[PDB]
Design a protein around this motif. Structure first.
Motif, PDB file in Angstrom:
ATOM      1  N   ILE A 162     -12.935  -8.447  12.321  1.00  0.00           N
ATOM      2  CA  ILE A 162     -11.346  -8.103  12.346  1.00  0.00           C
ATOM      3  C   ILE A 162     -10.790  -7.875  10.934  1.00  0.00           C
ATOM      4  O   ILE A 162     -11.478  -8.603   9.889  1.00  0.00           O
ATOM      5  N   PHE A 163     -10.120  -6.719  10.808  1.00  0.00           N
ATOM      6  CA  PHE A 163      -9.483  -6.533   9.703  1.00  0.00           C
ATOM      7  C   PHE A 163      -8.078  -7.100   9.785  1.00  0.00           C
ATOM      8  O   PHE A 163      -7.349  -6.736  10.644  1.00  0.00           O
ATOM      9  N   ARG A 164      -7.416  -7.950   8.490  1.00  0.00           N
ATOM     10  CA  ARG A 164      -6.321  -8.434   8.363  1.00  0.00           C
ATOM     11  C   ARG A 164      -5.709  -7.810   7.133  1.00  0.00           C
ATOM     12  O   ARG A 164      -6.516  -7.645   6.366  1.00  0.00           O
ATOM     13  N   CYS A 165      -4.521  -7.691   7.225  1.00  0.00           N
ATOM     14  CA  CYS A 165      -3.640  -7.708   6.040  1.00  0.00           C
ATOM     15  C   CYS A 165      -4.234  -8.524   4.896  1.00  0.00           C
ATOM     16  O   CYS A 165      -4.020  -9.715   5.151  1.00  0.00           O
ATOM     17  N   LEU A 174       5.330   1.780  11.437  1.00  0.00           N
ATOM     18  CA  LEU A 174       5.272   3.367  11.043  1.00  0.00           C
ATOM     19  C   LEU A 174       6.731   3.935  10.808  1.00  0.00           C
ATOM     20  O   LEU A 174       7.634   3.474  11.524  1.00  0.00           O
ATOM     21  N   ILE A 175       6.813   4.124   9.454  1.00  0.00           N
ATOM     22  CA  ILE A 175       8.249   4.761   8.758  1.00  0.00           C
ATOM     23  C   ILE A 175       8.382   6.074   8.975  1.00  0.00           C
ATOM     24  O   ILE A 175       7.711   6.776   8.606  1.00  0.00           O
ATOM     25  N   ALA A 223       2.458   3.624   7.076  1.00  0.00           N
ATOM     26  CA  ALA A 223       1.961   2.633   7.596  1.00  0.00           C
ATOM     27  C   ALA A 223       2.187   1.506   6.787  1.00  0.00           C
ATOM     28  O   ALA A 223       1.182   1.172   5.848  1.00  0.00           O
ATOM     29  N   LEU A 224       3.250   0.552   7.217  1.00  0.00           N
ATOM     30  CA  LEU A 224       3.269  -0.755   6.247  1.00  0.00           C
ATOM     31  C   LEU A 224       2.618  -1.915   7.275  1.00  0.00           C
ATOM     32  O   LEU A 224       2.784  -1.522   8.388  1.00  0.00           O
ATOM     33  N   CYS A 225       2.166  -2.843   6.759  1.00  0.00           N
ATOM     34  CA  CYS A 225       2.104  -4.216   7.333  1.00  0.00           C
ATOM     35  C   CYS A 225       3.354  -4.528   7.871  1.00  0.00           C
ATOM     36  O   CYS A 225       4.411  -4.760   7.367  1.00  0.00           O
ATOM     37  N   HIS A 243       1.998  -1.818   1.754  1.00  0.00           N
ATOM     38  CA  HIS A 243       1.771  -0.335   2.213  1.00  0.00           C
ATOM     39  C   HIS A 243       0.122  -0.417   2.612  1.00  0.00           C
ATOM     40  O   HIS A 243      -0.672  -0.196   1.629  1.00  0.00           O
ATOM     41  N   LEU A 244      -0.442  -0.394   3.791  1.00  0.00           N
ATOM     42  CA  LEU A 244      -1.534  -0.210   4.206  1.00  0.00           C
ATOM     43  C   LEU A 244      -2.386   1.120   4.414  1.00  0.00           C
ATOM     44  O   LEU A 244      -3.326   1.009   4.567  1.00  0.00           O
ATOM     45  N   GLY A 245      -1.432   2.146   4.731  1.00  0.00           N
ATOM     46  CA  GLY A 245      -2.074   3.357   4.926  1.00  0.00           C
ATOM     47  C   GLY A 245      -1.069   4.381   5.369  1.00  0.00           C
ATOM     48  O   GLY A 245       0.316   4.377   5.278  1.00  0.00           O
ATOM     49  N   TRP A 246      -1.682   5.038   6.438  1.00  0.00           N
ATOM     50  CA  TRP A 246      -0.880   6.108   7.261  1.00  0.00           C
ATOM     51  C   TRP A 246      -1.339   6.285   8.633  1.00  0.00           C
ATOM     52  O   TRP A 246      -2.367   6.081   8.682  1.00  0.00           O
ATOM     53  N   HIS A 247      -0.400   6.608   9.685  1.00  0.00           N
ATOM     54  CA  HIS A 247      -0.501   7.056  10.885  1.00  0.00           C
ATOM     55  C   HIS A 247      -0.649   8.766  10.966  1.00  0.00           C
ATOM     56  O   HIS A 247       0.125   9.144  10.239  1.00  0.00           O
ATOM     57  N   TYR A 248      -1.677   9.345  11.456  1.00  0.00           N
ATOM     58  CA  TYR A 248      -1.841  10.566  11.543  1.00  0.00           C
ATOM     59  C   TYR A 248      -1.715  11.009  12.887  1.00  0.00           C
ATOM     60  O   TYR A 248      -2.135  10.513  13.995  1.00  0.00           O
ATOM     61  N   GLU A 249      -0.880  12.223  13.071  1.00  0.00           N
ATOM     62  CA  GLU A 249      -0.744  12.738  14.458  1.00  0.00           C
ATOM     63  C   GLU A 249      -0.600  14.225  14.463  1.00  0.00           C
ATOM     64  O   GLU A 249      -0.623  15.055  13.295  1.00  0.00           O
ATOM     65  N   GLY A 250      -0.179  15.033  15.744  1.00  0.00           N
ATOM     66  CA  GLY A 250      -0.023  16.279  15.658  1.00  0.00           C
ATOM     67  C   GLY A 250      -1.252  17.099  15.663  1.00  0.00           C
ATOM     68  O   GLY A 250      -1.029  18.575  15.544  1.00  0.00           O
ATOM     69  N   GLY A 251      -2.258  16.392  15.647  1.00  0.00           N
ATOM     70  CA  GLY A 251      -3.716  17.529  15.391  1.00  0.00           C
ATOM     71  C   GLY A 251      -4.445  17.353  16.519  1.00  0.00           C
ATOM     72  O   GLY A 251      -3.848  17.237  18.000  1.00  0.00           O
TER      73      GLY A 251
END
Ligand SMILES: O=C1CC[C@]2(CC(c3ccccc3[N+](=O)[O-])=NO2)C(=O)N1
Ligand SMILES: [Zn+2]
Length: 108
Positions: free
Chosen positions: A6-9, A54-55, A73-75, A81-89
């Motif tokens: 498991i990955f946690r913040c 997701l902001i 993508a925030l916790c 700030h944990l990363g990004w969500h990617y979409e539209g692809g």
């Protein structure tokens, strides 16, 4: 009794993702990228994640992944700030790019 599933913040312990959900985008789950401010990120791609917030609306501006728009993508617990969500692809339509060193890996 797996110790690395498991990955946690790293900042608060929020449940975020799983080793089983790692996604080899273009043949590797790890991608190293910089933003326009020159900050280096070591990004792990995941098919799935939870516990995030997701902001705003997606943007293609300086996207690191051809054909995808990003959202920050925030916790969802602590706002880290944990990363990004990617979409539209395409194949896949969506995925998460999470900053490796902002997560902690541990047992289920
Ligand atoms: O795929 C991505 C997402 C993260 C980002 C996008 C970005 C950015 C680019 C233009 C305006 C605002 C932002 N921002 O993240 O706040 N800085 O780093 C980048 O360069 N590429
Ligand atoms: Zn957190």
């Amino acid at each position: 009794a797996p110790g690395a599933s498991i990955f946690r913040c790293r900042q608060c312990g929020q449940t975020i993702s799983r080793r089983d959900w790692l996604l080899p985008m273009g043949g590797d789950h790890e991608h190293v990228v910089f933003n326009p401010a020159g900050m280096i990120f070591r990004v792990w791609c995941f098919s799935l994640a939870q516990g995030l917030r997701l902001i705003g609306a997606p943007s293609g501006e300086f996207s690191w992944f051809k054909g995808y728009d990003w959202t920050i993508a925030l916790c969802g617990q602590c706002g880290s700030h944990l990363g990004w969500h990617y979409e539209g692809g395409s194949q896949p339509q969506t995925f998460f790019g999470l900053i490796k060193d902002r997560l902690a890996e541990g047992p289920a």
